[PDB]
Amino acid sequence: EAWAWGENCTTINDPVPYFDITPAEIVKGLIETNEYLGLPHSVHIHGNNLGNPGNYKDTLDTLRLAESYKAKNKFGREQVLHNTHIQFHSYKGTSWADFESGAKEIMDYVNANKNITCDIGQVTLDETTTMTADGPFEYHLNQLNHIKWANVDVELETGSGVVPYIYDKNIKVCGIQWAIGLELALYAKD
Amino acid sequence: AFAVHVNMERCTGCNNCVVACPVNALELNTVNPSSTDKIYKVINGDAVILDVKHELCAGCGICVDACPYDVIQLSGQPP
Amino acid sequence: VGQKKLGNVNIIDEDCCTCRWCAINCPTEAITVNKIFEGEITFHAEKCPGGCSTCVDVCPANAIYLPTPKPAKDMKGQ
Numbered sequence A: 001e002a003w004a005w006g007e008n009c010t011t012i013n014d015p016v017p018y019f020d021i022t023p024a025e026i027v028k029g030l031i032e033t034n035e036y037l038g039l040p041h042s043v044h045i046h047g048n049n050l051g052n053p054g055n056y057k058d059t060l061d062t063l064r065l066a067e068s069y070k071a072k073n074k075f076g077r078e079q080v081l082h083n084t085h086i087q088f089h090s091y092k093g094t095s096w097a098d099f100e101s102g103a104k105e106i107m108d109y110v111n112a113n114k115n116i117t118c119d120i121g122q123v124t125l126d127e128t129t130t131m132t133a134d135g136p137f138e139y140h141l142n143q144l145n146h147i148k149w150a151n152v153d154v155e156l157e158t159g160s161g162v163v164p165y166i167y168d169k170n171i172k173v174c175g176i177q178w179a180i181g182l183e184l185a186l187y188a189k190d
Numbered sequence B: 001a002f003a004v005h006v007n008m009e010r011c012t013g014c015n016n017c018v019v020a021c022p023v024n025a026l027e028l029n030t031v032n033p034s035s036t037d038k039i040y041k042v043i044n045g046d047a048v049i050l051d052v053k054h055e056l057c058a059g060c061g062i063c064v065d066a067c068p069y070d071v072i073q074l075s076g077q078p079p
Numbered sequence C: 001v002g003q004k005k006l007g008n009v010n011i012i013d014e015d016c017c018t019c020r021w022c023a024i025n026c027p028t029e030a031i032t033v034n035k036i037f038e039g040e041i042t043f044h045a046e047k048c049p050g051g052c053s054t055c056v057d058v059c060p061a062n063a064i065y066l067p068t069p070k071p072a073k074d075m076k077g078q
Ligand code: SF4
Pocket: B004, B020, B021, B022, B023, B024, B039, B056, B057, B058, B059, B060, B061, B062, B063, B064, B074
């Protein structure tokens, strides 16, 4: 929503423009709502600071938001929130020249906690278009690679962004991105 | 309490005289609305002034300035 | 040599309306205007139906303003 004005919430704590609610508060409120209604699927969560180096710290910060809930429903599920494409959230380091993998730390936290389930976003190393409902990531990607960019802001609801991208084999960045998902999947005890 | 006259012959139903009137905008856009009566409503494609007895207008000129193809004449003299 | 003051500045008295704009903004406090009327005027902003800047357009002394909307990352919930 801050993208609707042109900004982005770069962490878990900063407030939304004019609403003064934070990512942490909204995630917690939606978790309480979900587990109270007993919906089948948990709060599927994207996350913040997507696609930037060093955001494994923020990924742990956002995963620590479930430490006080229990999945109550008539359906069998042990999650309380589902953290998605985590190979995107498991980066490390300062920039793209000092960039390595934080999958070890992410999966240590997940192997600890039993109310957190994940999935990997393994990159298949080819040409693709990247579509996420958040604007700022797609805009940042467009400013990186200078290719097409489409933005679709919805009214009182979400954002959007479509940007082609080349995950080619001839880049250190893309190679490490490929390695990260495999590290995540191969560090899973459960 | 003035009198507004709408030239039905060139009214297109644009509804920018209804949206822009500040007496129409009193109901939904005010805290604790005072009066909920409306000067214009576009019935059958042309702007109809429900303010028959000339009690609610205030000669603001927001509606004359709003109509894209001038069609609203505002009378500042007693009807 | 001291001071220059080429010409004179003075107020047409049948046109001035005691606004205090030039007195309030004069650099050397050399203008003496006193308002003809005294009292108080209050604006209940929560009752203005928005796009009606007739008051702004007709105020002689341009006392009225439309308070400028704040930017994002500065609205602070107000
Ligand atoms: S002059 Fe002002 S108050 Fe009267 S009908 Fe037009 S917009 Fe409404």
